[PDB]
Amino acid sequence: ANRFTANIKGLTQASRNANDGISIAQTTEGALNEINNNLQRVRELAVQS
């Protein structure tokens, strides 16, 4: 029972760790969305040029 309890708590913590990873990945993705939109505007300007 001691061993099982330790594993249970560890896995529980790992759950929120994975959630944190999700959060950071999403934020990075949003930033990259902004970068991509700006680069699309650059493409517009190049097509003009």
């Binding site: 699309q40 505007r41 517009e44 097509v47």
Partner: protein, 52 residues
């Protein structure tokens, strides 16, 4: 002006009709704007890509 200097004013508005005439130039640049792959269509394509 029409009564008196009609030919003169014609030379201004139209002129040769090839590289002269206010209407001539206006037609040239409006055609450039409206031409395929023109500025308008380029902007619209950009917007469509953003929608995608």
């Amino acid at each position: 002006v029409l009564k008196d200097n009609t030919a003169a004013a014609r030379e201004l508005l139209v002129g040769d009709g090839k590289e002269t005439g206010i209407t001539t130039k206006i037609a040239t640049e409006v055609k450039s704007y409206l031409a395929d792959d023109g500025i308008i269509d380029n902007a619209q394509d950009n917007v469509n890509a953003t929608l995608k």
